[PDB]
Amino acid sequence: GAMGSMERASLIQKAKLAEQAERYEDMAAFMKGAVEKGEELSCEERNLLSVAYKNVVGGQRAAWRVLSSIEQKSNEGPEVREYREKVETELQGVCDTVLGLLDSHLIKEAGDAESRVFYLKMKGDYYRYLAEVATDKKRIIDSARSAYQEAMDISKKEMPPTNPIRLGLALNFSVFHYEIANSPEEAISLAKTTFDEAMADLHTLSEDSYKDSTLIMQLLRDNLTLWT
Amino acid sequence: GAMGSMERASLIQKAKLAEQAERYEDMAAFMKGAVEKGEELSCEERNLLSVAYKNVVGGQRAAWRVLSSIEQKSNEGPEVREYREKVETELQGVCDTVLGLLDSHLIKEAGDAESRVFYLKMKGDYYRYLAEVATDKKRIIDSARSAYQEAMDISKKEMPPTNPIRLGLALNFSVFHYEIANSPEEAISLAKTTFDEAMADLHTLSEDSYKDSTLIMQLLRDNLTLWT
Amino acid sequence: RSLSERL
Amino acid sequence: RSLSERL
Ligand SMILES: COc1ccc(C(=O)NCCN)c2cc(C(=N)N)sc12
Ligand SMILES: COc1ccc(C(=O)NCCN)c2cc(C(=N)N)sc12
Ligand SMILES: [Ca+2]
Ligand SMILES: [Ca+2]
Ligand SMILES: [Ca+2]
Ligand SMILES: [Ca+2]
Ligand SMILES: [Cl-]
Ligand SMILES: [Cl-]
Ligand SMILES: [Cl-]
Ligand SMILES: [Cl-]
Ligand SMILES: [Cl-]
Ligand SMILES: [Cl-]
Ligand SMILES: [Mg+2]
Ligand SMILES: [Mg+2]
Numbered sequence: 001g002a003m004g005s006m007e008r009a010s011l012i013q014k015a016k017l018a019e020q021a022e023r024y025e026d027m028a029a030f031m032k033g034a035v036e037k038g039e040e041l042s043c044e045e046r047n048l049l050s051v052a053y054k055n056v057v058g059g060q061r062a063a064w065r066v067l068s069s070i071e072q073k074s075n076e077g078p079e080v081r082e083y084r085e086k087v088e089t090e091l092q093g094v095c096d097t098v099l100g101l102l103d104s105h106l107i108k109e110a111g112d113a114e115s116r117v118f119y120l121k122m123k124g125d126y127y128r129y130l131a132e133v134a135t136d137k138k139r140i141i142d143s144a145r146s147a148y149q150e151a152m153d154i155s156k157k158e159m160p161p162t163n164p165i166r167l168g169l170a171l172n173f174s175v176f177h178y179e180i181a182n183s184p185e186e187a188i189s190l191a192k193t194t195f196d197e198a199m200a201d202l203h204t205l206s207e208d209s210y211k212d213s214t215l216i217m218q219l220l221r222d223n224l225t226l227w228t
Numbered sequence: 229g230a231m232g233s234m235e236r237a238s239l240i241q242k243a244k245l246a247e248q249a250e251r252y253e254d255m256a257a258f259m260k261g262a263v264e265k266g267e268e269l270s271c272e273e274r275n276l277l278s279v280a281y282k283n284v285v286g287g288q289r290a291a292w293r294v295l296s297s298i299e300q301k302s303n304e305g306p307e308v309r310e311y312r313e314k315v316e317t318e319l320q321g322v323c324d325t326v327l328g329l330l331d332s333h334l335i336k337e338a339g340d341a342e343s344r345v346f347y348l349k350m351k352g353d354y355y356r357y358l359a360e361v362a363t364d365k366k367r368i369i370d371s372a373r374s375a376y377q378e379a380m381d382i383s384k385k386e387m388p389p390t391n392p393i394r395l396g397l398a399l400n401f402s403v404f405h406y407e408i409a410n411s412p413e414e415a416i417s418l419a420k421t422t423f424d425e426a427m428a429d430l431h432t433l434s435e436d437s438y439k440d441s442t443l444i445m446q447l448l449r450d451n452l453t454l455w456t
Numbered sequence: 457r458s459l460s461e462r463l
Numbered sequence: 464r465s466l467s468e469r470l
Pocket of ligand 9: 001
C-alpha cells in the first residue's frame with residue numbers, strides 16, 4: 001500500500017480533513033490506507049470509507065452518464081466512445097478497489113450485525129455500480145443481488161426496522177430492483193413494507209433517532225411517489 | 229508530453245467533452261496536450277485552456293483555504309500542516325505547469341492583442357495564485373504585477389474599453405491590488421476608471437456584446453460595493 | 457432517476 | 464473575498 005508509511009490514526013485524521021476540504025480522492029486514499037493496516041473499522045471509520053468512495057464513484061457515474069448520452073445521440077468519430085471508455089474503465093477500477101478491500105479482509109472479520117450488514121450493503125452497491133455500466137452483466141447483477149440478500153437477512157434478524165443501516169440497505173436494494181434488475185414491482189413492494197414497518201417502530205426512538213430514521217424513510221416515500 | 233499520441237483536433241474535442249462531464253483534470257491534460265503540439269491557439273481554444281486550469285486550481289485554492297484556516301486555529305499534531313503542505317505543493321505544481329506552457333511557447337508566439345493580452349493576464353493570474361500561498365513572496369508578487377502591467381498597456385492601446393478580455397484583466401488586476409499587493413486604494417481607483425470608461429463605450433456595442441460587457445462590469449461594481 | 461441512500 | 468473574472 002502507498003500509505004504504509006503513515007500511522008493509522010494520522011490516516012483517519014487526514015481523511016476527515018480531506019472531507020472538510022472536499023478532497024474526496026485524497027480521502028479515499030487515506031481510508032484505503034487505514035483499511036490496509038489490517039485492523040477492523042469503528043462505526044465512524046466505516047462511514048468515512050463509504051463517504052470517500054461514494055463521492056469519487058459519484059463523480060464518475062455522473063460523467064459516464066453525460067458521455068454515454070452524447071455517445072447514444074451520435075448513434076441515432078471515435079473520440080466520444082474512447083473517452084467514455086476511459087471514464088468507464090476508471091469507474092470500474094474504483095469499484096474493484098472497494099470490492100477488493102471488502103474481500104481483503106473487512107467482510108470476513110465483521111462479526112457484529114452493524115459492521116457486517118454495512119460491508120455487505122457496500123458490496124451490493126459497488127456491484128450495482130459495475131452493473132450500471134456492464135453489458136458479464138448478468139453475473140455482476142447476481143453478485144449485487146447476492147450481497148444485498150445476505151445483508152437483508154441479517155438486518156431482519158438483528159436490527160430494528162428503523163435502524164438507519166437497515167433502512168439505507170432496503171432503500172438501495174429497492175433501487176437495484178427498479179433500476180438494474182427490471183423488477184419495478186419488487187422495488188415498490190420492498191419500499192412499502194420497509195416504510196410501514198419502520199413507521200410502527202418510531203415510537204421506540206428518541207428525538208435524534210427519530211430524525212435520523214424519518215430522513216431516510218422520506219427517500220423511500222419519494223421513490224414510491226416517482227414509481228407509482 | 230503524455231498526449232503526444234493523440235491528434236490535436238481529438239484533444240480539443242475531448243476537452244469539450246470533459247467540460248460537459250465536469251472532468252476538469254482530464255480537460256486540463258487534454259488542453260496541455262493540445263498546446264504542446266506547438267501550434268498557436270484559436271480564441272475558443274484559449275478559453276478552453278483557461279476554463280480547464282481555472283477549475284483545477286480553483287478546487288485547490290478552496291481546499292488550501294479550508295486547511296490553512298484549520299491550521300491557524302490550532303496555533304492560537306503535524307497532520308494539519310502536513311496535508312496543507314501537500315495540497316499547497318500540488319497547487320504550486322499546477323501553477324508552474326501553466327506558467328511553463330505560457331513560457332514555452334504561447335506568449336512569444338502571440339502577436340495579436342487578443343491573444344497576447346489573454347496569455348499575459350493568465351500569467352499574472354497564476355503568479356497571483358502562487359502569491360496567495362507564498363511567504364519568495366515579494367518576487368512572485370513582482371512577477372504577477374509585471375505580467376499584469378504589460379497586459380494592461382497593450383489592452384489600453386489596442387482594445388476598446390468594453391472588450392471582455394480588457395475588462396477581465398482590469399478586474400483581476402484590481403483584485404491583485406486589493407488582495408495581494410495591499411494597495412486597496414489602487415484597486416478601487418482602477419475599478420472605478422475601468423467601469424466608467426466602459427460605460428461610455430457601451431453605445432458602440434450590439435445587443436449580445438452589450439450583455440457580455442455589462443456582465444463583467446457588474447463584478448467591478450460588486451467589488452467596489454464590498455471595498456467602499 | 458431513483459434516489460439512493462445519502463451520506 | 465474579492466470577486467474574480469468568471470469563466
Ligand atoms: C451515520 O454515519 C456516521 C456515524 C457516526 C459518525 C461519527 O462522527 N462517529 C463518532 C464515533 N462514533 C459519522 C461521521 C461522518 C463523516 N465524517 N461524514 S458519517 C458518520
Ligand atoms: C469568451 O470565451 C469563449 C469565447 C468563445 C467560445 C467559443 O465557443 N468559440 C467558437 C469559435 N470562436 C468559448 C467556449 C468556451 C467553453 N467551452 N467553456 S469559453 C468561450
Ligand atoms: Ca498493498
Ligand atoms: Ca403492478
Ligand atoms: Ca513533454
Ligand atoms: Ca482613501
Ligand atoms: Cl503492499
Ligand atoms: Cl497502493
Ligand atoms: Cl497493492
Ligand atoms: Cl516530451
Ligand atoms: Cl506529460
Ligand atoms: Cl514533459
Ligand atoms: Mg502504528
Ligand atoms: Mg496530426
